[PDB]
Symmetry: C2
Subunit: 79 residues, 2 copies
C-alpha cells in the first residue's frame, strides 16, 4: 500500500452504474459485483474520488471507500 | 472489535440473495446493497460463516469477508 489500500463498494442507479464500473476497472482490482480494491497513492485516491464524483448523482448514489493501511486479510465463501 | 471487525460483501443468485440479506441483518450493520459490517467475537464469526454456508450455493455465489483489527476509516461519496 504505497500510501494506502482501499476497498470501494458502491450502490449506484442503473443509468450510471456501468460507467462507474468501467472507471474503477481502470484503477482498481474488481472483486465482485460493485466491489473494487487495491493499493493507491494519496494523489491517485484523490483522482479516483474526483472521477467518481463526476459520474454519480450525489442525491441518489452512494460510494463507500474504506481506507486501510495495507491489503486486508479476507476469507472467501463459495467461488 | 471485541475479537475482530468484519466487512462482508456478497454476490448471490437471485433465488438466494434475500435470505442472505435477512440473515446478515440479524448479526451486522447494513451499509448498502450487499454490504454489511460490524464487530464480532471469533465464535460469532464462526456462526456467521456457518449460517452463510447453509444459505448459499458454493458453486455459484461468492461471499468475501474482510477481517480487520478494528472499525476501518471510510469516506462516503453521495448519500
Amino acid at each position: 500500500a504505497m500510501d494506502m489500500y482501499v476497498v470501494i463498494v458502491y450502490d449506484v442507479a442503473v443509468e450510471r452504474v456501468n460507467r462507474v464500473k468501467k472507471f474503477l476497472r481502470r484503477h482498481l482490482h474488481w472483486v465482485q459485483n460493485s466491489v473494487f480494491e487495491g493499493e493507491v497513492t494519496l494523489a491517485e485516491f484523490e483522482r479516483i474520488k474526483a472521477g467518481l464524483l463526476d459520474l454519480i448523482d450525489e442525491d441518489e448514489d452512494s460510494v463507500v471507500i474504506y481506507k486501510l493501511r495495507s491489503m486486508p486479510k479476507r476469507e472467501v465463501l463459495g467461488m
